[PDB]
Design a protein around this ligand. Sequence first.
Ligand SMILES: [Zn+2]
Ligand SMILES: [Zn+2]
Ligand SMILES: [Zn+2]
Ligand SMILES: [Zn+2]
Lengths: 206, 206, 206, 206
Amino acid sequence: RKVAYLTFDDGPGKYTAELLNTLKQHDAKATFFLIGANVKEFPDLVKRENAEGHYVGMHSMTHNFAKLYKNGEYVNEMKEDQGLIANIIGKSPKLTRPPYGSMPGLNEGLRNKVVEGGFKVWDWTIDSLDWRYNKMPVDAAAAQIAQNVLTNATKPQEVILMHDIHPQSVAAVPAILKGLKEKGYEFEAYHEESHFPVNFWHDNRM
Amino acid sequence: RKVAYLTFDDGPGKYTAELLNTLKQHDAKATFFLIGANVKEFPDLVKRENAEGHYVGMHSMTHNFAKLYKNGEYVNEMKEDQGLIANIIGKSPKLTRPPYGSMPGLNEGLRNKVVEGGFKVWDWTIDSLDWRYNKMPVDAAAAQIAQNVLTNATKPQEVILMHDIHPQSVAAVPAILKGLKEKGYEFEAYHEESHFPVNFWHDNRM
Amino acid sequence: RKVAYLTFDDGPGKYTAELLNTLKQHDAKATFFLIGANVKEFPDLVKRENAEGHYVGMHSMTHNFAKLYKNGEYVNEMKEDQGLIANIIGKSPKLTRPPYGSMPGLNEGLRNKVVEGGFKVWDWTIDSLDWRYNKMPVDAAAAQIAQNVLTNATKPQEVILMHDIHPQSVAAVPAILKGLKEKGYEFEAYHEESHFPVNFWHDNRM
Amino acid sequence: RKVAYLTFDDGPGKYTAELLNTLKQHDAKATFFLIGANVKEFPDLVKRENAEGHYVGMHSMTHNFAKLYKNGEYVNEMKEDQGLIANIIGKSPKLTRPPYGSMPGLNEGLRNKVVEGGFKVWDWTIDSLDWRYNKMPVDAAAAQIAQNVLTNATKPQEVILMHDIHPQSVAAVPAILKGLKEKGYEFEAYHEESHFPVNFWHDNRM
Ligand SMILES: [Zn+2]
Ligand SMILES: [Zn+2]
Ligand SMILES: [Zn+2]
Ligand SMILES: [Zn+2]
């Protein structure tokens, strides 16, 4: 059983409805890590992400490296973000995705607070590098991004980092779906009852 | 006859219960040097350490170089720590482990007071360097820490400096227990009635 | 299509000639990010780095976080460093490596100035952590550093952070060159005509 | 082949003449590492150590850990000590023995200064632990010290740490000479043209 977990960071945004349409057509399920300010701006999209079978998790309030890690606000911000999301979808998600990844920001003290707060942490196994192609002609960018993902998909479980706020990322998804389907992957959302560790610290409590 | 004395400093803390279970699992005995604040925060773990055959000794109250050595509060702090531990376990340990080691902090004047007060002092023969491995995945860290101990264990008596307040340190202990047993070591606690001196000053009164 | 970019920071210094010999022996090309004071102390090594096919770039004048980022002297210092290097090798390098990395020091204001000044910025994808291994035997340190690099080199493009001003770092390079070659990597210098972005801000302008 | 290098630290002193008689009696050659203040106090013994075929090297002026390593006076003290010895034996020895050993005191900066000053550094491979038995009955103490050394002598080259300022160490030497001879060891003095690295840093420049 090969499973590909598409994850989308930093949203919702103005390309997210398009992305949800694409996912629905391919019968694919994915995972979204949302920033607090955008949850407030785009409640309909948050509702729709959950309503269409995708997992909705937290990507912090400020996405500010200094506040999250050095000043130790990571858990406070994930908790706040969690409450905004719960006000819309009617449940409190446990999975967080660290802005800029957990390494080295999420130090041993913060990891304890994550565990104590009942939160999980997912990093990723494949970086799509979609940000490289910002503001470049979308068609060529999307194909490159698809290539970045397809050629790195080698393991039975892959967690793919993309950002749905970039147009070239959303445009890349059709090719990624067809390509990973060829390789024998199914596309699933994260499921809290089926948690397994995916983090740069190899901290199995998270 | 080869004996390895695992010694764990700065605790107890949030990884100590797991460490105790690991030691019990391998029928290993060890030595714990505790900080007063943590004695007061985790009295149950102090009681567990002594109840399960380990030696419990003192690692001061402040762990502050200037107060302990420059201001000469070493013996006062160890005496205070001693009493807190005695109230939990019903005996007054005599062995101390200097924060930052005895060299150069524990000057002759302080060594004289240590002896006058009936205390002993243990430094170490192997530094695991475990606390320094805090910027990498825990399992990778633990493996390198185990390597440091295993490669340097060459004497019939080894006193090994570790810190049970770091996750990578506790994670390193299974490989250390396995490896040194293969090398012919038995893992024992410090025994007051069988003191032998181990200190950087080569002072056999402590 | 796998390329490893060895990058060496904070130099030149007393181990750099040895490192250069090692790289030459293995027909490997690398990248050096120099501190102004060392450019002035070791001009013959700067010249040699460029003469032997390696890329020479800037790592500031002061390597001081407060001056570079809080006081915003980053671009000024990189330009001053650039001029010093230019007087030696006859080129004006465009690529800078931020002291302590770009995150979070290089705020948006500073990134704009970087771009307007015609500079580029590289962080890294692998941190060797080499500078942290300075309390153990040099060969033992080198082995653990090589392990850090080899175990983490999994992507088609890897940018490896090392420091040539530490003995254990230069001692690790032979095992690194051998190991990554077996993994299919070629060792190349940064090329300005072939810039791809590598920075923690995901800012593809620099 | 097999060579044992007996080395005696912290002298000369009031047992050194006896030790020299013992060495001569057994046709054994050794190495002495002298403290400046005792070179001043015991010039006849320094002359005699050289006259009877032993190596005379430096063990600093102050034997003060803080001055030597943290304050960085190691090379200055060794050079000063070197001059005192040279005034007696008419040449300037290059080999130093770090008070308390080189690890971790002799940091990378200090090792460079050692090398730049034309000095070498010898630690040891066998610790006699002679200080443990200070002020105990000399006969039993000497026997135990001999056992400590004989039991740990397993390699073709062994460098043995003793202190000729302890009476029990000098008393142990006959049993040590007898026992190691039976194991096939020759007793040689250090010679600069026969240098091979013996230091805890595995720094092959020293
Ligand atoms: Zn993000
Ligand atoms: Zn401590
Ligand atoms: Zn640097
Ligand atoms: Zn000494």
